[PDB]
Symmetry: none
Subunit: 75 residues, 6 copies
Amino acid sequence: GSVQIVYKPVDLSKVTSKCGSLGNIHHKPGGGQVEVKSEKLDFKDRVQSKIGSLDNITHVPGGGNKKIETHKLTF
Amino acid sequence: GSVQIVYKPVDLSKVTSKCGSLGNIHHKPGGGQVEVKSEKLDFKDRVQSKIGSLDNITHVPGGGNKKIETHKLTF
Amino acid sequence: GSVQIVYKPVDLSKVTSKCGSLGNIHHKPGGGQVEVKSEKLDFKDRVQSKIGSLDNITHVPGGGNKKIETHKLTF
Amino acid sequence: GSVQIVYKPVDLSKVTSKCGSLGNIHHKPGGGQVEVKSEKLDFKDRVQSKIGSLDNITHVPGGGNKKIETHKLTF
Amino acid sequence: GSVQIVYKPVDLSKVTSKCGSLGNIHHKPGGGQVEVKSEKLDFKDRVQSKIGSLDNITHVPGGGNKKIETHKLTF
Amino acid sequence: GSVQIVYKPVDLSKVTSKCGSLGNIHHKPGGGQVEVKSEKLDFKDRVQSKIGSLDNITHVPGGGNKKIETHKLTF
């Protein structure tokens, strides 16, 4: 007799991530007037402060993709 | 007898990441007036401060892609 | 007898990253008036400060791509 | 005696027209397949024909604006 | 005696027309498959014919604006 | 006696027309396959024909603006 192998896996797959803000409509978003008045404050600690009328932040640590293929043929 | 191996794995796949802000419409976004008044304040460790009417920050630590193919044929 | 190997793996795949701000429309974005008034402040460690009407920041530590192929044929 | 006329009409008004398609998202609009098969047809006056999968026609004969001010001061 | 006129009409008004398609989202609108088969038709008249899977027409003859001011002062 | 006129009419108004397609996003619009087969057709007057998968037409006969001011002072 005789032996024949025809090995043809076909991969058409799509691994897709769509993260954050995609295709949105922001028509006239309005941040109102902001006022901050501070006096006599005492800090023994770290300070991180942020002040603002309109913060349109998009933050993406995620959306990463991992694809692994192992192909083994042994005769 | 005889042996024949025909080996043609085909990869047409797409690994895609779309992270942050894509295809959005920001029509007349308006950050209103900001005022900050501060006096006599006392700080004894590190200070960070950030003041502003309109921030459009897009931050992407993510969206990274990893593709591995291992192919082994052994006779 | 005889032995034959016909090894033709095909990779046409695409690894793609689209990170940050892509294809968006920012029509007349308006950062309003900012005022910051400070007096008698005392700091005993490091200070980092940022002031402004419109901050259209894009920051991308990510979006990196890693592709590994190993091919081994052995007889 | 004496006569004093102080005449200061103020117009800050807006006359505005917004006509057709404004500020929309059309996300993957898909016209499907079109097939037209015609034979032996006989025409004895004017013919107009229009064939197509996706038409995004905006037609605006309108949206015109007319402003009249007449000012008369007579002593 | 004496005579004084202080004529100060103030117009802050808006005349606004918004006609057609404004601020909509059309997510994946899909026009199905169209097939038209015709034979042996006879026309003694004008023909106007239109064939299509997705017709996203916006038509605006209207939305026009007319503002008239007459100001008359007589002494 | 005496006579005084202080004539200072102010126009800061706006006449605006926004006609056709403005500020829209068409993300991946897809015109499908079009096929037209014709034979043995007979025409004895004028023919006007148009064939196409994607027609993104904007037509504006309108949107014209007409501003008339007449000022008359007479003594």
